[PDB]
Structure formats: structure tokens, C-alpha cells
Amino acid sequence: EPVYPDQLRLFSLGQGVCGDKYRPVNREEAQSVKSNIVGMMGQWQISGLANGWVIMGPGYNGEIKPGTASNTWCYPTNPVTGEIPTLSALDIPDGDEVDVQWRLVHDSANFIKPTSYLAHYLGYAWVGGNHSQYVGEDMDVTRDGDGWVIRGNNDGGCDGYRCGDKTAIKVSNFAYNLDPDSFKHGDVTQSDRQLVKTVVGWAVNDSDTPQSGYDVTLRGDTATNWSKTNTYGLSEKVTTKNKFKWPLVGETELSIEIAANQSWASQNGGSTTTSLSQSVRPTVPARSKIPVKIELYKADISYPYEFKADVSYDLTLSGFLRWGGNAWYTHPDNRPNWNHTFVIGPYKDKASSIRYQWDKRYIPGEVKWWDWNWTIQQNGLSTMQNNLARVLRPVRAGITGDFSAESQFAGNIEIGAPVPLGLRLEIPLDAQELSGLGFNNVSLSVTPAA
Numbered sequence: 001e002p003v004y005p006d007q008l009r010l011f012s013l014g015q016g017v018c019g020d021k022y023r024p025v026n027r028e029e030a031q032s033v034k035s036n037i038v039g040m041m042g043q044w045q046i047s048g049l050a051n052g053w054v055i056m057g058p059g060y061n062g063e064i065k066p067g068t069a070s071n072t073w074c075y076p077t078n079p080v081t082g083e084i085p086t087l088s089a090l091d092i093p094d095g096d097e098v099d100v101q102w103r104l105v106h107d108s109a110n111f112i113k114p115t116s117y118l119a120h121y122l123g124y125a126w127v128g129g130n131h132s133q134y135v136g137e138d139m140d141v142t143r144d145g146d147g148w149v150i151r152g153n154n155d156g157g158c159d160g161y162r163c164g165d166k167t168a169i170k171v172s173n174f175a176y177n178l179d180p181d182s183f184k185h186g187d188v189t190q191s192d193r194q195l196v197k198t199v200v201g202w203a204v205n206d207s208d209t210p211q212s213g214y215d216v217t218l219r220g221d222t223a224t225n226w227s228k229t230n231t232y233g234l235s236e237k238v239t240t241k242n243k244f245k246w247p248l249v250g251e252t253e254l255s256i257e258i259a260a261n262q263s264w265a266s267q268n269g270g271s272t273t274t275s276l277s278q279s280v281r282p283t284v285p286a287r288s289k290i291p292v293k294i295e296l297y298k299a300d301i302s303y304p305y306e307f308k309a310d311v312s313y314d315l316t317l318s319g320f321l322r323w324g325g326n327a328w329y330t331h332p333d334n335r336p337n338w339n340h341t342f343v344i345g346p347y348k349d350k351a352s353s354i355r356y357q358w359d360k361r362y363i364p365g366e367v368k369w370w371d372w373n374w375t376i377q378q379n380g381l382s383t384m385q386n387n388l389a390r391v392l393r394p395v396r397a398g399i400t401g402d403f404s405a406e407s408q409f410a411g412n413i414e415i416g417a418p419v420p421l422g423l424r425l426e427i428p429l430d431a432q433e434l435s436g437l438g439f440n441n442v443s444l445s446v447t448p449a450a
Contacts, residue, residue, distance in 0.1 A: 003025070003032055004080075005037070006359070008025065008033075008040075008075055009022060009074050010047060010071060010073055011071065011072050011074050013071075013072070015069065015070055015072075016051075016072060017072060018072055019074065021077055022074035022077065023050075023075060023076075024048065024050035024051075024073065024074055025037075025050065025072075026049060030049050030053075030055050030064055030073065031064055034055070034062050037055055037062070037073060038055070038057065038058050041058065041062075042057050043057050044059045045057035046067065046069050047071050047072065047073050048067075048068075048070070048071060048073065049072070052066055052067070052068065054068070054069045080359065081381065082382075082384070082385050084358055084388040084389055084392060085389040086392075087389050087393040088394075089308070090110055090393050090395045090396065091398065092395060094232045094234065094306075094398040094400045095232045095233075095234065095397075096232050096234060097234045097237055099234075100311070101174060104171075104311070106141055108136075110390065110393070112136050112139055112150055112169075113137075114136075114390035114391045115150065115169045115391060116128065116136025116150070117135055117387050118317070118387060118388070119169060119319070120136075121327070121379055121383075122327045122340075122375065123321045123322050123325055123327045124319045124322070125320050125321070126152060126158075126160070126166045127167045127169075127319075128152045128166075129152035129154075129166075130156050130158050131156070138152060138153045139151065139153065144170060146172060147170055147171055148171040148172070149168055149169070149171075150168070150169040151167070151168045152167075162320065162335070165320060167319025168318040168319060169315065169316075169318075170315070170316035171313050171314070172314045172316065173313055174313045175345065176234065176239070176312075177240065177309055177312070178239065178240045178264060178308075179308055179309070179310055179396075180240060180244040180247075180258070180307070182306075182396075183247045183306075183307055184306050185249060185303040186303055186304035186306075187304075188249060188301060188303045189304070189402075190300060190301060191249075191252070191299075191300075192299060192301075193251060193252050193299040195296070195297055196296050196297060196298050197434075197437060199294040199427065200293045201293070201426050201427025201428065202291060202427070203216060203284055203289060203290050203425055204288075204421060204425075205285065205289065205423060207286060208286050210284065210286055211283070211284045211286075211423045212281065212282075212283040212284075213281075213448055213449050214281065214422060214423035214447065214448055214449065215280070215446070215447050215448070216279065216281070216423075216425065216445070216446055217277070217278065217279040217413075217445055218277070218278040218410060218442070218443070218444055219276055219277060219441075219442075219443050220275075220276040220434075220439060220441045220443060221273050221440050221441055222274050222276065222409060222438055222439055223271045223272065223273045223274065223408065223438060224255055224256060224405055224407045225270070225271050225405070225406045225407075226246075226256055226403070226406070227268060227402075227404050227405075228267070228305070228402070228404075230264065230265050230401045231400045231401050232400070233265075235263075235264040235265040235399055235401070236264075237263070238263070238265070238309045238397075238399055239261060239262060239263060240258060240259075240260050240264075241260055243257055243260045244257070244258050246258060250301055252300075252301055252407060253409055254301075254405050256272055257272070264309075269404075274409070276442065278294065278412055280413045280415060281449055282415045285418050288419060288420055289419060289421055289426075290416055290417070290418050291415070291417075292413060292414070292415055292427060292444075293413075293414050293416070294410050294412075296408070296410055296411075297409055297410070297411065298406070298407065299406075299409075300404075300406040300407065301403075301404070301405055302405070303403055304401070305400065305401060305403045308396040309397045309399050310345065310395070311396060311397055312343065312344060312346065313344050314343055314344075314352075315341060315391075316339065316341040316342075317338070317340050317342070318338070320335045320338060321335060322335070323335050325378070327372070327375050328370060329368060331374075340370075344391070350366070350368070354388060355392065357372055358388065361373050372384070422448065425445070
């Protein structure tokens, strides 16, 4: 009876008031799923809990204390029980795509038995081999070309009606999505931040009135020269859903962006040009000038890196449904040949999402495929939960290589204390010299704040 965070609902109906069939979350329950509640709240949001308690937003460190709130965190009085556990990821070391797929489909405890049991619990017949009395044992794994086929061994003979018509578990359409947040690295092989030059000058206010209305801004461009290797071949097929910035390691700054819908392996490095954009709005006293300075740095860094790529695939259950016991919502009693594919990974549609179907199993309007409530009645909730937890356990492949980058950047434009004499600048810039240092099209300008 844990509190399931996805069944929480925030109501805005008055102090301690929930919607129909909801009851307020109490301070103990809230504390048990604090991070989940707080992550759904506004920075300084304060939300009600049962009996005069409130939970506060992340700005307040999600504290739980006595308080009055006209909005309330609520939970069903009759929740949907037995949520499918989200197990920790199943890691597959980096390797070629064949290596990765090979390890996954030959895995008895983590793949063959769980998917075999799924099909069995759904009503599919003969999900096992001839030399075993148990489901998902004596299973041959063969190739369908691009896809894999897991099916009970059929050599020799068997006892049962249509026993030679072994149900087939098919695995196809593998996808690999790199999770940027999974980043980690080894020893930072090389690191350092070097001052190559200091650009110094003056901003002068030759008027009888203090000047505060001029932006002083630096523009131009540098370049980050970088490279990244891929230890194995899976990287050829790995992509990221969204563009992201190469992570910051150390006390330097890089502006590298990894592009979405593009092969990890095709993104191996080069020269990414970066714009200089520092700006500041100084106040210069009347008839005085201020020292303005900009430090120009260069830095490099190298390390072995690693990311994880979430592995997804189509799981197609193919065989006939047992008479007097199957989960299809119309419960066919004519042992029809059946085909159904689940997408093991992110959601694509309702028909292929086990999680969606399971979570929505008490909404009759939604039961258009498998009747998960019937699987529970047959096997018990626990059995079904544990099985789906394994079927849906995240599979992740390690994506490794070496990273190396050489960068150039400016620090902030700094302003000094005023010395006696619109706003004007006196800051010498030598284009060629600057170019030699990796700083191009450099300019320093004054413009009104308007």
C-alpha cells in the first residue's frame, strides 16, 4: 500500500477539499513521496495536506509544516493497486550492435523467461520447449534477419492439443536513445585554464553629469576545437531525442552542442565557433574615466567518457490463444492465430503500451486489447506485477569513448575605480595579434541602454 505518485492530484477547491473520490494526503504520506510531490510544485507554492498541514515548493526545500492552504494534495480513496515496479536499469556493456542484441535476447532470467511468461499469462499456447515442463525453458533463439525469434524447441515429440504449434516471441525494430543526463567520465587526462592576454582600456565620461546609460559590449568569435571517439560500433545507430550541450567538466567552459536525429558516431568533433557577447552598463562619474579590462583565456581538457543509451524494441507475440483461458478482451474460444506487438520502450500508442493498459485497466472504455484485470484474477496481482517489472525493466547500453577539447573564451568585462580626466571608449585591439590567439572579429562598443 505505498502511495503511488502518479495517482496524486492537486485540487484547488478550498482548505482540505478534494475532488470526488479523493482524500487529502497526510504529512507522513507526503514525506514518503516528498521529492515526487515537490517536483510537481511551483517554486514558492504552498499546498495543503490533511489536518492543517502544508507541503511547500522546492524554493522552500519542500518543507512540511503546519499551515493553512486553499489548495490540497489528494489521493484516491480507492486507488488503482499493484503498480508495475520500475526496477533499476539492466546495463549492457558497450560493444557492437550485434554484441548488445546478442546479450539481450540470450538472457534467460532477464529476457527469455519474462517475455515467455507474459505471453503465457496473456493466453498464448505452448510458450515452452519439448524438453521442459516449465514456461520459457528449452527455447531456441534464431534470427529473422534483422529481428530475433524465441520459440520452444520442437525436436522429438510432445503431448497436448496442437503442441507443435509453439508460440513465437519476436524482437525487432531496435532503437537506441542516448540519455545526456547519464554522463560520466574517467580521469580528467588533461585539464588547465590559461590567461593568454588582458585587453585593457578606458571608458571616459567627458561630461558634468554621471553617465549610467551606455552599454559597453564585446563581440567577436572564438572556436572550440574538439573530438570524441567511439570505442565500439553500436554508436553508429545511437541518437538523442533532443539537442544538448556537452557537459561541463572542470573549471573551464565549452560550448559544444550534440544534435538530435543524428548518429552519435557521425558527430565526432571539429571546430565549433563561439560568439563573444559580454556586456556591462557602468556608471562613470562626471569628468572621469574608468579602467575596463577583459581577460582572454584558453583551456583544454580530455577524458574518457561514458553515456547510457536506452534500448527499445518491438516485442511481437505470435501464436494461438488457449480455449478456456486468454486475456484478449473478447475472450475468443476458437483458438485463433494471434499477433500482437508491444513496444518495449517509450510510449507510441495505446495498443502497444503495456503500462498504459495496466494503469488504465479499471476504465472499461479503455479495455480494447488485453484484459489485465483477468490476468490478475488468474495469477494474482503479485505474479503479474513482478513479471511486468521484468518485461519492462529498462535496458541500457554503455556508450564509451575519449573526449578532447581545446577552447578559447573571454571572461567578463570588468570595470575599475574612477580616475579624474555620450560615453566613449579607448581600448586598443590588434586584429592580427588577436587572430593569432584564436580571437576573431573582435570589437568593443558603447551603445545607449535604450
